[PDB]
Design a protein around this ligand. Structure first.
Ligand SMILES: NC(=[NH2+])N1CCCCC1
Length: 223
């Protein structure tokens, strides 16, 4: 996250870190046994890490649970990033508490102008690289479909939305991928892509979770 603030330990209780020897992506806990992330985060050997503050320190509220399976969306296209969503199942259910908690799926798609919370452990620099180790947060509005398409000609599908600031300076970044965009207490987006980070006229692009609620529910019900 570039231009954000330190969230505070365990203040984003649905935020998970995906670890394969190291943190490589975020995710969102949507029930005691399932995480939503980005399809472009898929790999072998995933451990889901819940209750994290500093991802380099065991502070006392963590739960580390290996994945039993993951399910990339059937229509994910890695060239266009259309349908950039996957589900990850935990081998055992997490123990839910005030610091490890699920986030609800949306009932309705959120509108341009709605304020959301974007969070992650990704790079905090638009030029160069620095990883923060503690969770960073950014409050940002959803942008109009028109603004989003104008920023990225030929690239925005009906399964994507932009959020952030056209002026620059405040955005998600590398290492935030797969993490949450929460608006009014519901998971509306997944950190997906953008050109650089926090560049003028290049806002963040997010997977539009409301389009996937039926797929998520039906997949969980049978897996
Ligand atoms: N919001 C961005 N600019 N991002 C998304 C996460 C990966 C790097 C590009």
């Amino acid at each position: 996250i570039v231009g954000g603030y330190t969230c505070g330990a365990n203040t984003v209780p649905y935020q998970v870190s995906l670890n394969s020897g190291y943190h490589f992506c975020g995710g969102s806990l949507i029930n005691s046994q399932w995480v939503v992330s980005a399809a472009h985060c898929y790999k072998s050997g995933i451990q889901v890490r819940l209750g994290e503050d500093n991802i380099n320190v065991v502070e006392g509220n963590e739960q580390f649970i290996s994945a039993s399976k993951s399910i990339v969306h059937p229509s994910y296209n890695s060239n266009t990033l259309n349908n950039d969503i996957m589900l990850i199942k935990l081998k055992s259910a997490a123990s839910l508490n005030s610091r490890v908690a699920s986030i609800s799926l949306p009932t309705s798609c959120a509108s341009a102008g709605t304020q959301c919370l974007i969070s992650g452990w990704g790079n905090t620099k638009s030029s160069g690289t620095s990883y923060p180790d503690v969770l960073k947060c950014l409050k940002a509005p959803i942008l109009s479909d028109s603004s989003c398409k104008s920023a990225y000609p030929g690239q925005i599908t009906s399964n994507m939305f932009c959020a952030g600031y056209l002026e620059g300076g405040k955005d998600s970044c590398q290492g935030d991928s797969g993490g949450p965009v929460v608006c009014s207490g519901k998971l509306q987006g997944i950190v997906s892509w953008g050109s650089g980070c926090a560049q003028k006229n290049k806002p963040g692009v997010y997977t539009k979770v409301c389009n996937y609620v039926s797929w998520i529910k039906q997949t969980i019900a049978s897996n």
